Design a protein around this ligand. Structure first.
Ligand SMILES: *C/C=C1/C(=C/c2[nH]c(/C=C3[NH+]=C(/C=C4\NC(=O)C(C=C)=C4C)C(C)=C\3CCC(=O)O)c(CCC(=O)O)c2C)NC(=O)[C@H]1C
Ligand SMILES: *C/C=C1/C(=C/c2[nH]c(/C=C3[NH+]=C(/C=C4\NC(=O)C(C=C)=C4C)C(C)=C\3CCC(=O)O)c(CCC(=O)O)c2C)NC(=O)[C@H]1C
Lengths: 305, 305
């Protein structure tokens, strides 16, 4: 079972108990966007990331308690219609807003809570390139090479899980001068069981800046439940300190991965590194999610042979 | 061999390589005091902790380059006479200064560098209590109980090293309500080899506040040598992040230990915890150093029987 999070008196995570980090409920976000939680009926803003004024203009203490009818009058009705009570937490409302001096808005529902993620915002041959691959290796290589072209990431790897959950880099497209990870294998504990579980459900995650401090949600608990706000489906979710350190020690300033899910099992990751911090456009991330789905279908086929 | 420190491009320490942390050259101090390094001939202030204005009044950018003749006109000549070239780094000049609105000054020499530590400042039956102990256990118990009375620490332990460097709490005096560590043994890696080595030479260290950020030395390298400033003999030395986390996970806000050195070997530690941050007076620390020396003589005698 998970430790309590830091804000509920849980210990700081060490290598003895990686697997017990409640990574899904960090009570904080990455500072390149803002996060609001709102009641799914009233649209009352229940929680905000402490940086919410940097993106949304209003004071933090004045945003709390206001409704999405006031804040987002054109989106609020579409938001309600798109994310009614009972819908799954993978379903997402996405809107582009014009704001003082563009913001991408991503909304999903967990129970009675709407989770709103604000971040700044501002192809076809890829699918047939994956399809044309004669064997798994070729597919692996075209997948990593295509993802690198679309994203500009310094390194894109296809990271394959073995049955014992150890991983291997089976293909990679890298910037000139970077050393190869191709064929290197890594312990199961590098992506621990709860991460692997989370990654089977929520297919994309990232750390835009491996040195950025996480921005608290205030209030930290959902006042609907007096319990942690589930952030597994929020891309703005704060990354595990343990993983961030791992990335820093590798010289990785930005990281992003996409789950490759085959037969309902975590088959692998498209894993991306940038040496510098790097915010991939939200539209671009949507392409990667889709590319990961398409790759997952292709991998099932070609690995059967 | 040690990793380079963080400021010279070394990695962040993980449990794989605890023993490679260059804990003696953190390039930083604990924020409850200030540290200056000065040339041992000219008294030119070569490095300062970035907080030096909080304690010493002058601007940081104006302190750099000034001499101890200007700053400390009454101490500078005594300092030079007390710490001439070639003297050992355990030798310490200690002075009490009156300052705007008292500061304890501790100086030691390493090579051609004077290291100046500033912190705010403001018994006899103990020795005969140690002497009167009929066996090692009794001595252990009176030692921890005496240290607790003198310091007010919430927990004082006698931590004994076994031949395999695993440790055991063989005696402790604790605040009511604290759970016992008596008889508990711990892995060798909790106090890794370089710490054990450092602790054989420099007999006292502390973390006044296990949540305090370390204050950088500026410039970080000694300009005499373009190499790290040795801080093994500075009590203001920043504590290993790994140890600070360990203490935080135990609910320890302040920690202090004194080496018990028997036959030139690290026999054990008088290890002290406070739940809240806690700065022990510099005079009081001097008593503990002496108590640790006296305890070390007593332990040699009584363990022979
Ligand atoms: C005791 C804690 C450990 C630990 C925790 C941890 N790791 C992750 C997430 C990832 N780890 C990854 C590992 C690699 N990336 C690489 O590039 C390579 C080798 C070339 C490896 C082995 C990857 C890909 C992820 C996924 C996230 C990402 O794509 O960056 C988590 C979960 C993070 C989160 O979602 O918040 C956790 C908790 N990792 C360790 O190494 C030990 C110390
Ligand atoms: C991978 C790194 C590890 C590690 C590093 C580490 N630990 C120390 C210093 C100390 N550790 C101590 C251990 C204990 N204190 C206790 O109270 C108990 C149990 C009741 C234990 C086992 C102690 C006493 C010290 C000495 C300092 C002090 O008195 O607080 C260092 C050196 C710190 C420094 O001087 O900068 C280091 C590098 N410790 C681990 O547990 C692993 C994670």
């Amino acid at each position: 079972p998970f430790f309590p999070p830091l804000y509920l008196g849980g210990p700081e995570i060490t290598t003895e108990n990686c697997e017990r980090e409640p990574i899904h409920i960090p009570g904080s976000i990455q500072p390149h966007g803002a996060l609001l939680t709102a009641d799914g009926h009233s649209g009352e803003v229940l929680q905000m990331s402490l940086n919410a004024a940097t993106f949304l203009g209003q004071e933090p203490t004045v945003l709390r308690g206001q409704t999405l009818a006031a804040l987002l009058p054109e989106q609020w009705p579409a938001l309600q219609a798109a994310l009614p009570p009972g819908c799954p937490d993978a379903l997402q409302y996405r809107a582009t807003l014009d704001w003082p001096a563009h913001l991408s808005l991503t909304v999903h529902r967990v129970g009675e809570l709407l989770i709103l993620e604000f971040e700044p915002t501002e192809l076809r041959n890829a699918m047939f390139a994956l399809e044309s691959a004669p064997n798994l290796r070729a597919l692996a290589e075209v997948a990593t090479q295509t993802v690198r072209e679309l994203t500009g990431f310094d390194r894109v790897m296809l990271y394959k899980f073995a049955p014992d959950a150890t991983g291997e880099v089976i293909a990679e497209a890298r910037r000139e001068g970077l050393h190869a990870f191709l064929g290197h294998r890594f312990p199961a504990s590098d992506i621990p069981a709860q991460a692997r579980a989370l990654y089977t459900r929520h297919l994309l995650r990232l750390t835009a800046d491996t040195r950025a401090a996480a921005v608290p949600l205030d209030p930290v608990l959902n006042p609907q439940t007096n319990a942690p706000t589930p952030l597994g489906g929020a891309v703005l979710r704060a990354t595990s300190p343990m993983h961030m350190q791992y990335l820093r020690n590798m010289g990785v300033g930005s990281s992003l991965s996409v789950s490759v899910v085959v037969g309902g099992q975590l088959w692998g990751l498209i894993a991306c590194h940038h040496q510098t911090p790097y915010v991939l456009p939200p539209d671009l991330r949507t392409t990667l999610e889709y590319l990961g789905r398409l790759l997952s279908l292709q991998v099932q086929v070609k690995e059967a042979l």
